């Protein structure tokens, strides 16, 4: 609805009880799964009940996190990315051209529709309830007539925006449909020659209205809220940072009607039985702690000690041990009584290794997968497993290349057009030439009247660009043009043969 | 039937004896199977008869639940999802268009019919007696004439709703058919700028009537009931929370006739011989306790101790041990009498590991399945096993993508239509191109008069979108249109050849 | 008291004998084998392996 009343910080900052209960565990699971440099070793210490801090810091120095949960998330994401997502064009309402233009860039991250959906799936995989919002661009003009309003309505260019889970504050939703939702957004105004400024926005999305309350030039607090705000009247009118007032510091709402007729947000919710991160994160933090303890034990018991029993006065004993040390090598025969090389045998280290291995095995068996594939015709399956991640990175590379080519075309002064279609980086396979040859042959064995010229042109072009590489773009273009002309001639010949 | 009498909280809150006996064990089994962060380590302690709480908390810190029961439930759900569920359209009574419109979204969670049925099956799998209710949307108007009533009757849009088992209070049912059922429903009124309010509803569904008794602005108790209720007259008329009265706090029923002619609920009841969760949950909690004890023992006996026998006065002994510690490395030869590296051998740790392994093996053999698949042509079976969960997540992804595309179409101002059919994410297989080629060839080898053009178009479009990926939607649309035109021409040509 | 305090990787104790006493385990696998043979009989009552 239409809000026009300023609200104090306490009213904006409220969080529903269910979200208050759920956000901490989601943050913990996300921190465990993501790993990386954000991990704090202090939080994952199996310390023997507050021993000396020196040994604690020495143990912390040996922190080597093995994020097997991150590996499992990566594996699931790559496997799901290996699938195919398709849209039937004829079922799209309205003009198809605008749909294609939108599908050129579905979001501000330039990813394609499949890439965006896979990213949403990954975000839900690490922590459920991935939220997406669909919005437009804003255009404002004065002295607006009916034609100007018509143009403004006709110039809408929607795009997607992934709302972080931790930024969600409250939402009313029945089943999967969301009646309304209020979340937070910390937006940083970056100055090229000054300190970064921060603003805090509280966005409430309703059935037919969207509203934002903005606090300007604030300081973010350790709880994710506002700690200090700017006050120009402060400092005898010069302005300074003062503590936030929960009853007197009010933000004026700015609202407008999106005319969507429904809340323009969608929540993807991974099923509880499928959400595995909830059941392995504790195992992952146990792995962190156990690995730290294991490395500390190995370091503190890894050296080899060599003791003696002198052969027959503390000064005399000092003289003896000095001599012994000096003559302790291959080029001397010592005169001692017992000089065993004392060494750790090692049965507890492999015990802890086995414990960590079984924790990793449980992590990888939470999903029905066997880690023995990477523990110790046939290997073609592993090659295809690698090709899956290769295809994912190839899709990302193709998106980046499309953006780069668009910018390059803009550099020449050309206005782009067709967004420069780019293919490839999608079929990683050993011995690919004869696979393309087999594809060509199978296509040609089909009833020629049933094969469009475009498919043959595409397959032949793929073969041409596979057979010759490292060649100038001119050479490939010439070969492709010759192929196109020849295929057109052959298709026309077979068509006229079939006609009579 | 028609109820019009207010009832005290005691009358509403009654629970039948069989439900009173069955709900606790169902809750225990569900908690054991789901696992996750909801697990409380205190409940799964094999404590040595009340030892010091410090060691108890130290042991609790090493709680790493391995929910093998959750893995088994996930495996069964995925395997069942791998099947095919089909509806014969011609057998549907009434108009088919309304059936298709309903099947676009069978419930508020946007899942399809197969997805909803699989979710019901999963809920029954973790705990039997999954209850589903079929309801409509509510529309109320004044000064209603006969035409208005006709429109209200004709504007019914049914959907499904899964009633939680723990919310069931009493039901009269013969066999599988349910004569009537009274359950509870805690509905939270969320305020975007205020504390969440709670209401408690008791819903009685009868043969031809449905009734609800509602208590407003209540506090949920630890037993799932009502503890405190709001009272506006309290606080000298300002209102406050007061304890619930079991004889004087009465809720006014609101009832209406659904005219279904029978109770609009269905109970899915997994057969006792098939319900395995009843026979492994104790093993799962035993696994929890044993794993906690095993990790505690390993941590307390995992370090390596190194003792000496000094070579020849407590102060002198202190001086000696200080010196020894300083010179205990690779760059020194110590002068001691005995310096063994004492270490745990480890036979009890592997004993407990074997015990936990045999418990897990029993859990996985409760269903006729072998866990050795993930313990240590041929591997294609394991790849297909992975593809099963891939297909499940793909179905979920396709549902989410359909919802997102519907919202996007609404953003353009289009009124949707056909719900934007989306396919894919259903065939995960190594080397997929030649499989589609084989499908195309086998289709074309069939009697051409018996193959509709739509099937050929679909298969060729699948091949086209598989051969080229990462390309602009425009390119795929152009290729598909060319394929459609060519296939139409070929079909017409073969038809006219067959005619004469 | 002193011994307990200095019983870790970061200390060299001055004792005379500090073995880590642990159960070897031969009876546990014996009972496991007995239960396994009972299960094998249960599954061989029907002609199944």
Author numbering:
A (entry chain D), B (entry chain C): 1 to 312, 332 to 395, 404 to 527
C (entry chain B): 341 to 389
Quote the original article.
A-1(L) is a Myoviridae cyanophage isolated in 1970s9 that specifically infects the model cyanobacterium Anabaena sp. PCC 7120. Using cryo-electron microscopy (cryo-EM), we solved the structure of A-1(L) tail machine, which consists of three parts: a 205-Å-long neck, a 1045-Å-long contractile tail with a complicated baseplate, and six pairs of tail fibers. The dodecameric gp2 portal, the pentadecameric gp5 and the hexameric gp7 sequentially constitute the neck of A-1(L), to which five neck fibers are attached. The long and contractile tail of A-1(L) contains 24 rings of gp10 hexamers that form the tube, surrounded by the sheath of 24 helically stacked gp9 hexamers.
Twelve gp2 subunits form a dodecameric portal with a central channel of 25 Å in diameter at the narrowest tunnel loop. Notably, we observed two extra densities: one in the central channel and one around the wing of portal dodecamer, which were assigned to two segments of the dsDNA genome in our model, respectively. The dodecameric portal is surrounded by five major capsid gp4 hexamers in a 12:5 symmetry-mismatch pattern. The wing domain (residues Met1-Tyr275) of portal interacts with the A domain (residues Ser178-Asn282, Leu353-Gln365) and P domain (residues Asn22-Arg177, Leu283-Asp352) of corresponding major capsid subunit, forming a circular cleft that accommodates a segment of the genomic dsDNA. The dodecameric portal/gp2 forms a channel for the passage of genomic DNA, whereas the hexameric neck/gp7 provides an interface for the docking of tail. At the 5-fold vertex of A-1(L) capsid, the 12-fold portal/gp2 dodecamer, the 15-fold neck/gp5 pentadecamer, and the 6-fold neck/gp7 hexamer are sequentially interlocked to form a symmetry-mismatched neck. The dodecameric portal/gp2, gp5 pentadecamer and gp7 hexamer form a symmetry-mismatched neck, which are perfectly accommodated to the 5-fold vertex of icosahedral capsid.
